[PDB]
Amino acid sequence: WXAXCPA
Amino acid sequence: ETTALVCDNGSGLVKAGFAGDDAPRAVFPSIVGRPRHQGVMVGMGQKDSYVGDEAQSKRGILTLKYPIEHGIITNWDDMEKIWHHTFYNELRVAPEEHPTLLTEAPLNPKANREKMTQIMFETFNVPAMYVAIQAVLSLYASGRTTGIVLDSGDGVTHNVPIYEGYALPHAIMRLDLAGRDLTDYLMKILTERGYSFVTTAEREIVRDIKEKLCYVALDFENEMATAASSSSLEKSYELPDGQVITIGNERFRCPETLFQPSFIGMESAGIHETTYNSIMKCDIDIRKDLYANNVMSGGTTMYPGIADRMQKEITALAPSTMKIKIIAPPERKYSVWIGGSILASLSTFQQMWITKQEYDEAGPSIVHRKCF
Amino acid sequence: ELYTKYARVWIPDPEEVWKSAELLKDYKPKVLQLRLKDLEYCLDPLPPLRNPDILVGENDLTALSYLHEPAVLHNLKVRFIDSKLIYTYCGIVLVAINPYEQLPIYGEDIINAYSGQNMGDMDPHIFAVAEEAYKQMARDERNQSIIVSGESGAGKTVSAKYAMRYFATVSGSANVEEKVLASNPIMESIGNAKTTRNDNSSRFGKYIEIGFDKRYRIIGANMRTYLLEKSRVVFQAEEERNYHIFYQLCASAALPEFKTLRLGNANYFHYTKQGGSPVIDGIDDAKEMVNTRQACTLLGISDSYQMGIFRILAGILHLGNVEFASRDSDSCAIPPKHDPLTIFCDLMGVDYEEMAHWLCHRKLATATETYIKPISKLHAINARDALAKHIYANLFNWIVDHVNKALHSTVKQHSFIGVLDIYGFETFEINSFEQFCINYANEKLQQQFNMHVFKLEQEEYMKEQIPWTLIDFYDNQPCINLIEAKMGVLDLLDEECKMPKGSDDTWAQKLYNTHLNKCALFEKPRLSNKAFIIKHFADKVEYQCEGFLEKNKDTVYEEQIKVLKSSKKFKLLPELFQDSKEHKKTVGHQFRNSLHLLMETLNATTPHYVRCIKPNDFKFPFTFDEKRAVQQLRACGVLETIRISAAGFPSRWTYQEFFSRYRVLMKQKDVLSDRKQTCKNVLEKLILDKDKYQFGKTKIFFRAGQVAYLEKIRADKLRAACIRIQKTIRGWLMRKKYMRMRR
Amino acid sequence: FNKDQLEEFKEAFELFDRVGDGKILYSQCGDVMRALGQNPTNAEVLKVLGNPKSDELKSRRVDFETFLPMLQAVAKYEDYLEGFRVFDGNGKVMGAELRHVLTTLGEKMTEEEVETVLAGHEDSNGCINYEAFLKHILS
Ligand SMILES: Nc1ncnc2c1ncn2[C@@H]1O[C@H](COP(=O)(O)OP(=O)(O)O)[C@@H](O)[C@H]1O
Ligand SMILES: Nc1ncnc2c1ncn2[C@@H]1O[C@H](COP(=O)(O)OP(=O)(O)O)[C@@H](O)[C@H]1O
Ligand SMILES: [Mg+2]
Ligand SMILES: [Mg+2]
């Protein structure tokens, strides 16, 4: 992703 | 007439084929490999890349990236190779001549749709494109117009309640627990038995174990006590080199994490309790219909017994009178592709495509505006 | 604007579609005083006007001076009843009305008499059109075909019989035709059905190519079939029947050969049972099949294959009795032993357990693996019926091949003349997917007809000097676009077959939403959601949506075909299949594609046309009923053709024939041996302007009514001179009486 | 008409009186006019007679004085030639066609009248020189 997770 | 293409960017597989077929004409892991060692033999062949079944065959020599993580495309440069390989090698088709249909998880970052379009029109020059919610396509796949679809991929799990062909977007839940996190947990617990799997090529060796020998406990505490009480659960497996490895209760302990993400250390509840808490968000009128039409979808729901474990569990949350039914067609891994094949061949849909002309006028923002 | 005392006019009536009057007050400008034997009849925001008795009975319906439905119906009535003439022409179209008694007319010496002569030279007869076909094929290597069209029982098959007999006697020098006629019992037995209005209606379209050598001797004939009504096999509206062969077979169950076929009575089997009407009056099917079996025996199909055919049809009847128990919303099954599957598997020699599985489940196989699913009881029932329809349609396409093997000849076919027998445009008091297909094929055929007639008139005018623009034509393409094109009625019908849950109720809503006020030609019946109304070229037709989808749907599960193809008991069952994307295609798209295979065959060819119309419903010999015949003649597009011709310059006179008839108008002042320039001078006196006539090279063309104008002024001059002559004769004769008395 | 004409016409009229009352029937008035050189149409004859009804036409008798205004009213070749040239160009006319038209069109005559007027004017082919026949019937 961009925040709460690695992607 | 020119038939549309139907393509599904899973995390774990690419599935592609021609609309109107009842199965994909290509499936292969959406995996990109690069050589890491030194090339000793001058005059041997040389490649900067392998894709799919190639990167599978040689994997001992390669580092394997997935360009997709939790359904977000994490680098485009490899993804564009995966699409290029899909159209030119797997389907052997010019994309200039066929509409294309592309498939996406419900919440994922809105920038993803813009880039995923921009590459279809700039790189492949596709005539026409559309992007469709995986759970919607699962309904077309399973012959229904009302249901709640639980869909779980290699990279994402999500629920989407749909009633009478209206989707119900306030009631939509997304847990990114998936095949890959079941793999990584499987590695961590396998370490307990004195095996370690350390590398990308080796992680797929784990995954083949997960696919062959995992199953879901119909009571967790019963079978856990049983395996301690006797080894009848225990089964064993041959690594590529011929080493045997042997696995007990531990093969169910991974499927149980879907029902207790406390093992992985997630906050949120198992997918039964998300499914229920999704239905509760729905209007009380509809719920009697969503309880009957529970549809399993995607490969992470292929584990033997997940259907019964779901039914026995959600039948404990739901009020005693309601009829609870769970619907698990044995092709469900394909079903998102099948339902996309059905959708792409409807005549009403032909008005829906994003045209190259209208993208060229409107710019990639069009994909949010038109598509849903 | 002519009406006088002693004018005559046609008026509408409830009982005969038109009735004549004489007008007995001179009209000038609001109501007319008419005698019949009195009425005053209203004018409204003019009445039709009637041809002088010299015209009525004239041998070409375009010869008349006033063209309209009353005059046409009158001419056909008087020719049929009074002169016992069954044949009449309109424009190029021959129009044929079945005498429904035998007649002398078809004998050999008439066949010989017609040969060699043009369509103006002789009174109309079917031989005259066949002789036109033969004469065009003699001018041009271009193939010719003959198209025979009308309501069921109007006499299409008999008109084909005679049209082929013409070639057989004139060309033939020795035995194709005796084989062709021996083919009729077989193709009727497999291909004819009993329908609400009459029995023995042909549910397909049949094309015979008579082949010629390079001296136009008949070498051999090739038969093609199109547009088969496959849906009738498994479904039947009330008081109809499926194809005769099934009843003949059931009626024959007592015979010892059939005894192994374990047949019932004809209302036992679920396919034959549905219509509720086993028996046709005055046909004993048990002694029909003796005919059809002899037809096979003569036409070269062995007793081995005949017993194969009946073994397959008994297989289908036994297949239909298979009944499925449910287990589930999503699973069904077959009870522990089910007798109509036990018998069926013995008849076609396959494993009961394998059919039990593959009937019940279906298989789907990807790049990697094979998956086997239960299916709901409704899908299993649709699959069973799609299988029965596929077995039937392949047995049909096989019997037509083993016929052609008897009818081909190895010599090269230099050219062919083709004869086509096809159901006519048809409108009923319920309409259903079959009628929608029939009316779509008729819309196509009369597009080809309109374009052909418009071409032939563009050719004729350019044989003259005259500008084309006066010509125009009825283009019916927007109805074909409504029926056939994408987002058309058939396309949205297949879409409901694709869509996850589909019903005629939900279909019709799509129809309305898309067409209802987007298109001039699609309409909703004011007081139903369930039906829709199409403005077909002839007349508005109302189609009910209910049970389109069940009729629309075929999909054969490939593994069900494979279980049959694995059979080894007898040789015919493998042979039928032996010879996918095809298997998916719905009935409404196999019909489309077979209609293209037809229209591309005809569009390679030059058409000639025969229209059949049926005088009366009740089988009364050689009477006539107005109320049907007007509907038939609208269904034939004859009325539209006539109205178009009346808009143009319908009448033709050759300068010689005009001068000869109208010399009475002229004077010795005004005759000069160059006939054309004399008539050019005279006509401008008599009729004001070219706006009413054109000078051709060899003919004069008139707008409607100028012929009646000529006959009016001629008859006036004729009476004026006649009475002058009588008056003068009596003057001198009375002077003779004055001499008689005074002497 | 002068006194001499009136006297000759009255004498002729009285010669046609077959009942002795000095009168003829209305239906004979036209015949007398034609015998006296008039050529009225049947319509003209009925008009000068006053379009009489059947009963008075068949039984009502009128003397000369009432007849005279009618004769006056009636009194107050190239057309004949063109009329015959309609049905012709060798100067002949078929006997059959003239017979048919005279017995079936116009003021239809009896077969005996047509035979009588045509008698002696047709040749072996059955053709009449119509200029001579016209002069003959106008004499
Ligand atoms: N038969 C099976 N049993 C258990 N797990 C499976 C099975 N097939 C696939 N999986 C796992 O599920 C994931 C693939 O699911 P899939 O629906 O193909 O993903 P995607 O969303 O990319 O299509 C992978 O983690 C794979 O290991
Ligand atoms: N020209 C004809 N002479 C004698 N009988 C005729 C003629 N035309 C039609 N009929 C009668 O009408 C019947 C019905 O017409 P037919 O051609 O057999 O059916 P269809 O018109 O459906 O092909 C014929 O069997 C025959 O008895
Ligand atoms: Mg998926
Ligand atoms: Mg017939």
Angle between helices C675-686 and C655-662 (to 10 degrees): 60
- Quote the CA–CA distance of B170 and C353 in Å, as a whole number: 50
Resolution in A: 3.5
Give domain limits for chain D.
Answer: 2-77, 78-137
- Quote the CA–CA distance of B310 and B157 in Å, as a whole number: 15
How far does the centroid of ligand 4 lie from the alpha carbon of residue C159, in Å?
A: 10
Q: Give the number of other CB atoms < 10 A from CB of residue B233.
A: 18
What are the φ and ψ backbone dihedral angles of C347, each rounded to 5 degrees? -60, -40
The protein residue whose alpha carbon is closest to atom 10 in ligand 2 is: C100
Do the beta carbons of residue B208 and residue B201 sit within 8 Å? no
Do the beta carbons of residue D63 and residue D22 sit within 8 Å? yes
C637 is an annotated ligand-binding site residue: no
Residue C223 tokens read as 């038969």
3-class DSSP assignment, residue B1: coil
List the catalytic residue out of C424, C502, C588, C637: C424
Residue C740 tokens read as 């008689």
Please choose, from the candidates C694, C710, C593, C699, the residue with its C-alpha nearest in 3D space to the C-alpha of residue C649: C694
CA dihedral sign, ordered C710, C711, C714, C719: negative
Q: Is C626 exposed, middle or buried (0-12, 13-18, 19+ CB in 10 A)?
A: middle
Q: Which residue has the tokens 């396509």?
A: B137
Verify whether residue C201 is a known catalytic residue: yes
Residues in chain A whose beta carbon is closer than 8 A to a beta carbon of chain B?
Answer: 1-2, 5-7
CB distance C486–B25 less than 8 Å?
no
Residue D88 tokens read as 């012709």
Do the beta carbons of residue C295 and residue C179 sit within 8 Å? no
Taking domain B183-271, whether its CATH number is 3.90.640.10 is answered by yes
Residue C187 tokens read as 């193709």
How far does the centroid of ligand 1 lie from the alpha carbon of residue C317, in Å?
A: 46
CA dihedral sign, ordered B200, B205, B209, B212: positive
Using alpha carbons only, how large is chain C's radius of gyration in Å? 32
> Which helix (H) or strand (E) segment is C47 a member of?
none
Verify whether residue C660 is a known catalytic residue: no
What are the φ and ψ backbone dihedral angles of C4, each rounded to 5 degrees? -140, 170
Solved with: cryo-EM
Bridge partners of C701, per DSSP, are: C652, C694
Ligand 1 within 6 A of CB of B255: no
Q: Per CATH, the architecture of B136-182+272-334 is what?
A: 2-Layer Sandwich (3.30)
CB distance B144–C367 less than 8 Å?
no
C550: distance to nearest CA of chain B, Å?
A: 17
Ligand 2 within 6 A of CB of C98: yes
CA dihedral sign, ordered B183, B188, B190, B196: positive
Vertex D64: Cα angle to D58 and D67 (nearest 5): 65
Residue C413 tokens read as 């076919």
Please choose, from the candidates C139, C213, C135, the residue with its C-alpha nearest in 3D space to the C-alpha of residue C173: C213
Listed as own residue / partner, the contacts of D24-29 with beta carbons closer than 8 Å and 24 or more positions apart are D24/D61, D24/D62, D24/D67, D25/D57, D25/D58, D25/D59, D25/D60, D25/D61, D25/D62, D26/D52, D26/D56, D26/D57, D26/D60, D26/D62, D27/D57, D27/D58, D29/D62, D29/D67, D29/D70
Q: Which chains have 3+ CB pairs within 8 A of A?
A: B
Q: Give the number of other CB atoms < 10 A from CB of residue B208.
A: 12
- Quote the CA–CA distance of C314 and B167 in Å, as a whole number: 50
Do the beta carbons of residue C585 and residue C549 sit within 8 Å? no
> Which helix (H) or strand (E) segment is B13 a member of?
strand B13-18
3-class DSSP assignment, residue B263: coil
Please choose, from the candidates C413, C724, B200, B69, the residue with its C-alpha nearest in 3D space to the C-alpha of residue D102: C724
- Quote the CA–CA distance of C426 and B341 in Å, as a whole number: 39
Instruction: Look at strands B173-175 and B157-163 and give their pairing.
Output: antiparallel
Q: Which atom of ligand 2 is nearest to the CA of C96?
A: 1
**Same fold across B2-28+70-135+335-368 and B136-182+272-334:** yes
> Which helix (H) or strand (E) segment is C444 a member of?
helix C433-463
- Quote the CA–CA distance of C31 and C40 in Å, as a whole number: 7
Name the DSSP letter for residue B363: -
For chain D, the straight-line distance linking the first and the last C-alpha, in angstroms and rounded, comes to: 21
3-class SS string, C73-119 = HHHHHHHHHCCCCCEEEECCEEEEECCCCCCHHHCHHHHHHHCCCCC
The protein residue whose alpha carbon is closest to atom 21 in ligand 1 is: B153
Q: Which atom of ligand 1 is nearest to the CA of B207?
A: 27
CB contact set of B85 (below 8 Å; sequence gap of 6+): B51, B52
Give which of B30, B66, B69, B184 to mutate to test A binding, by max A Cβ within 10 Å. Answer: B69
| Distances B81 to B50, B119, B336 between C-alpha atoms, Å | 9, 11, 23
- Quote the CA–CA distance of C688 and C667 in Å, as a whole number: 19
Listed as own residue / partner, the contacts of C567-570 with beta carbons closer than 8 Å and 24 or more positions apart are C567/C348, C567/C349, C567/C350, C568/C349, C569/C348, C569/C349, C570/C308, C570/C311, C570/C349
Residue C156 tokens read as 């299409």
Instruction: Look at strands B244-247 and B173-175 and give their pairing.
Output: unpaired
3-class DSSP assignment, residue C268: coil
Q: Which residue has the tokens 């095809």?
A: C582
Superfamily of the domain at B2-28+70-135+335-368:
ATPase, nucleotide binding domain (3.30.420.40)
D95 vs C: CB within 8 A: no
C731 is an annotated ligand-binding site residue: no
Instruction: Look at strands B326-327 and B354-355 and give their pairing.
Output: unpaired
Chain B positions in Cβ-Cβ contact with residue C330 (cut-off 8 Å): 327
| Domain boundaries C445-552, corresponding CATH code | 1.20.58.530
> Which helix (H) or strand (E) segment is C10 a member of?
strand C7-12
Bridge partners of C700, per DSSP, are: C653, C695
- Quote the CA–CA distance of C549 and C500 in Å, as a whole number: 13
Verify whether residue C394 is a known catalytic residue: no
Do the beta carbons of residue C91 and residue C611 sit within 8 Å? no
Ligand 2 pocket, mutate which of C100, C166, C192, C201 (most atoms under 8 A from CB)? C100
CB distance C726–D32 less than 8 Å?
no
Ligand 1 within 6 A of CB of B256: no
Using alpha carbons only, how large is chain A's radius of gyration in Å? 4
Do the beta carbons of residue C466 and residue C460 sit within 8 Å? no
Please choose, from the candidates C239, C152, C248, C154, the residue with its C-alpha nearest in 3D space to the C-alpha of residue C200: C152
**CATH classification for the domain delimited by B29-69, as one of 3.40.30.10, 3.40.50.300, 3.30.499.10, 2.30.36.70:** 2.30.36.70
Residue D114 tokens read as 């047509």
CB contact set of B152 (below 8 Å; sequence gap of 6+): B158, B177, B178, B179, B258, B271, B297, B298, B299, B300, B301
Bridge partners of D115, per DSSP, are: none
Bridge partners of C415, per DSSP, are: C212
CB distance C729–D109 less than 8 Å?
yes
Q: What type of residue sits at position C669?
A: K
3-class DSSP assignment, residue D11: helix
Do the beta carbons of residue B358 and residue B127 sit within 8 Å? no
Q: Is C247 exposed, middle or buried (0-12, 13-18, 19+ CB in 10 A)?
A: buried
Residues listed for chain D: 139
Instruction: Look at strands B5-9 and B100-104 and give their pairing.
Output: parallel
Please choose, from the candidates B303, B330, B332, the residue with its C-alpha nearest in 3D space to the C-alpha of residue B134: B332
Please choose, from the candidates C539, C458, C549, the residue with its C-alpha nearest in 3D space to the C-alpha of residue C499: C549
CB distance A6–B109 less than 8 Å?
no
Residue C6 tokens read as 């002693």
C156 is an annotated ligand-binding site residue: yes
Q: Is C106 exposed, middle or buried (0-12, 13-18, 19+ CB in 10 A)?
A: middle
Vertex C19: Cα angle to C14 and C25 (nearest 5): 120
Q: What type of residue sits at position C580?
A: S
> Which helix (H) or strand (E) segment is C607 a member of?
strand C606-613
- Quote the CA–CA distance of C146 and C127 in Å, as a whole number: 12
Residue D7 tokens read as 């006297």
Residue C621 tokens read as 């010999």
Alpha carbon of residue D111 to chain centroid: 16
3-class DSSP assignment, residue D80: helix
Q: Which residue of C has its CA nearest to B325?
A: C329
Q: Which atom of ligand 2 is nearest to the CA of C612?
A: 21
Do the beta carbons of residue C740 and residue C734 sit within 8 Å? no
Q: What type of residue sits at position C167?
A: F
Q: Is B237 exposed, middle or buried (0-12, 13-18, 19+ CB in 10 A)?
A: middle
3-class SS string, C110-143 = HHHHHCCCCCCCCCCCHHHHHHHHHHHHHHCCCC
C151 is an annotated ligand-binding site residue: yes
CA dihedral sign, ordered C332, C338, C344, C350: positive
Chain A positions in Cβ-Cβ contact with residue B74 (cut-off 8 Å): 7
List the catalytic residue out of C20, C59, C169, C198: C198
Do the beta carbons of residue C500 and residue B143 sit within 8 Å? yes
Do the beta carbons of residue C429 and residue C155 sit within 8 Å? no
Give which of B176, B177, B181, B266 to mutate to test A binding, by max A Cβ within 10 Å. Answer: B176
- Helix residue spans in C123-236 (DSSP H): 126-139, 156-170, 177-191
3-class DSSP assignment, residue B293: coil
Q: Is B22 exposed, middle or buried (0-12, 13-18, 19+ CB in 10 A)?
A: middle
B10: left (phi over 0), alpha (psi -120 to 50) or beta: beta
CB distance B70–A2 less than 8 Å?
no
- Quote the CA–CA distance of B30 and B271 in Å, as a whole number: 26
Chain B positions in Cβ-Cβ contact with residue C368 (cut-off 8 Å): 27
> Which helix (H) or strand (E) segment is C628 a member of?
helix C626-635
3-class DSSP assignment, residue C495: helix
What are the φ and ψ backbone dihedral angles of D80, each rounded to 5 degrees? -60, -40
CB contact set of C53 (below 8 Å; sequence gap of 6+): none
3-class DSSP assignment, residue B167: strand
- Quote the CA–CA distance of D89 and D129 in Å, as a whole number: 11
Verify whether residue C300 is a known catalytic residue: no
Q: Which residue has the tokens 């289908």?
A: C316
Q: Could you say which residues from 21 to 80 on chain B have a Cβ atom under 8 Å away from some Cβ of chain C?
A: 22-27
Give domain limits for chain B.
Answer: 2-28+70-135+335-368, 29-69, 136-182+272-334, 183-271
3-class SS string, C515-565 = HCCCCCCEECCCCCCCEEEEECCCCEEEEECCCCHHHHCCCCCHHHHHHHH
> Which helix (H) or strand (E) segment is B30 a member of?
none
